[PDB]
Symmetry: D2
Subunit: 239 residues, 4 copies
């Protein structure tokens, strides 16, 4: 393939859908997660087993580089969360969420940029949330909310610094999507009902619907689109 | 063609580029402006001569409907401006800007929605600006700034109301684009220099680069994207 | 008194509370509305009977000037609304809402600025809403939403232009407040319940609580605060 | 005094000005920093020497509690920065900035809340920046930008969770203020000129002007104001 892409958290949910959409655009994709084998074989992608909660990010980027023969696109879709209120949350749990979502985002982008710069073209796509703009409503997720909001600042900062290198950096903010990760929410009506009532479209999204936009932000369509957050939430935030 | 689209201000600048991109997607497009003939013939679109600053908007939508055999997409890219500071601006000049940019946006969307609802699928694309989020900097454009910001509220409101009808409504916010309309700005360095210094990419956009994103917001890619503003500004706002 | 203030819609709800808070700060206040007599006598303010939906705004400002012996502060708290969805709303109803909320805001500020500039100090306070940032949720108010959002653009534009004249311009965005105007909402639980569930503080505001912040934005506390919106909503938007 | 307040970074710049304004409101204030002695004696505050970049935050809050006889207000104004672009920044430097600005913000608030809840009234004031909304322009501060933006998410999250406990949580976003910390910026015109050109008021703020608003957000004026960011920037963001 032509453009080379690395997608973390690419074996499940949104990450997997993004990897699939990229393969569809003719990109050579590498999927990174703890168990990427099955997904990689199904999607026709390169598997890169890794534990991003502990393994050195720079090491994953180097493996992606040598496995793909280059690096043009980076999508950090890895997921993890500790749904506990601030007063019940430990510092270790706090740092776990912030580390994977923000620290790793920084480390991966920092390691990838020089290769995108070398190619003269790059796309960095961070994954946000409706919590990039709100606090999650009935769900107690202060750490996740803080991390996903922090990504907007990182997005603007890196976009500003790397624009002249041919790199565009944006934040895709998915709304409420049907994935294994959000399954415990679609669970009890106590949470699903109030949330869904605020979604104009009246339904949660399918991972593939979110991926359509991700592909755009990883393509030539985003040539002049950088340092921005793009919310794909069925109208939730506008409600 | 399959999907039917009406693009106002479609004979020049951004509007023309959007019409061209839509034709490229295989849409049957109608171009509306005072003198749409040449552009329509060049792009392979249907011409609909109109003076949106005076002609009844509902009349233009009906003509588009009967000319295309349906109506699925509406892009209000008409342009006009009175670059005068608030204390030097007359009420007539104020209303002229607000009328074309906001009042006509409302009237066109209101008239189009029932036809999109009839089709069970629709896309409304309003055109914003960096002034949807700022005041224009060195340029005195209070009326334009107010109008383009007001469009964000209209966008959210219509998106909420029409989501269940199959209609998605968004606001495309172009940054500084090279068009005849902005020519008097790229004019003296007094204005061009300060502005460009704040654009990370270091250059103004080409109309076609803005149109790439417009096409997305007028397509299946936006199935779950509604009630949002999308800034394509080369990083200006993130700076 | 020292500082002179004009407050439209100052005989009821939020407007009245703001007028009362200003009188408390020792300002000489003028209250404008169709029937300001009783409120003016109760608050110790100057009454200026007017129908801002039809009377020339410049005329009201001139009357305020001559009635107070100057003009330093302007608060446009007049209210009016047509709670109808876009497809059921007439253009006349649309313009009625936009005229009073936005057109009059512009006209009043434009007429007041020269007097504030003459004094070398001024405060313009526009009144927003949670709909300056959202679409009102279960309530169908597209015109109001558009108007209150448009005020953010006007706020930024005038703030930029008049900053060097000693004028600060901001937008106070009240959340859900208990007033006669919102009474029909606190009415049926169908609307009150869903909304209140999204307010962290679990209750609607009292007009006086909103006025505390209004006073600040009309005082020396705002010396370096201009071109901003300040939401006082009990946490609704952050939810 | 009645209300008890802890202000970190309270011996210099904005932090010191906030402490002074609070003492002026009749609050019993404790100032925390590495060398708070001189400032505490000058302001009439309680000194709490600490190195927040290494000392346990919970320990500082406990010392404040026992030193003041309670805890109602928390202002985290400590400052630190590594002005290096992303590609030149080390992970240790990144974590240093994020630790003091965000991690410590979380830890201090988490430790303080139970005491505010015990009192049935509390005010948490985090310190943002124009970089809570932009990337700093000509200044390379990706870590600081990310941290100050992340604080907006934390602000919303804690505000939502603690609202019913009588605690209000907000983010004060100062613009460009004259302090020792920003001295190296007001230094060369290369940076000062471009920035100042974007400030409508045409000048940088004095610490005391920022403190006026801080006091408000730490007082009864904020009774119904929570989960919000308030920018006091002389119009910079609105430009």
């Amino acid at each position: 393939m032509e453009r080379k892409a690395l997608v973390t958290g690419g074996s499940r949910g949104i990450g997997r859908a993004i990897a699939e959409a990229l393969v569809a655009r003719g990109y050579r994709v590498a999927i990174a997660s703890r168990n990427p084998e099955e997904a990689a074989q199904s999607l026709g992608a390169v598997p890169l087993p890794t534990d991003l909660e502990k393994d050195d990010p720079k090491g994953l980027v180097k493996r992606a580089l040598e496995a793909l023969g280059g690096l043009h696109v980076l999508v950090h879709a890895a997921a993890v969360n500790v749904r506990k209120p601030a007063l019940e949350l430990s510092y270790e749990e706090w740092r776990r969420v912030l580390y994977l979502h923000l620290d790793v985002a920084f480390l991966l982008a920092q390691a990838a940029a020089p290769h995108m710069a070398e190619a003269g073209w790059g796309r960095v796509l961070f994954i946000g949330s409706v919590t990039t703009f709100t606090a999650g409503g009935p769900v107690p997720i202060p750490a996740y909310t803080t991390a996903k909001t922090a990504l907007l600042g990182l997005t603007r900062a890196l976009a500003k610094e790397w624009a002249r290198l041919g790199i565009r950096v944006n934040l895709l903010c998915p709304g409420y999507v049907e994935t294994e990760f959000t399954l415990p929410l679609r669970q009890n009506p106590e949470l699903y009902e109030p949330i869904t009532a605020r979604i104009p479209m009246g339904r949660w999204a399918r991972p593939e619907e979110i991926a359509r936009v991700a592909a755009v932000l990883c393509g030539d369509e985003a040539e002049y689109l950088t340092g921005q957050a793009v919310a794909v939430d069925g109208g939730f935030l506008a409600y």
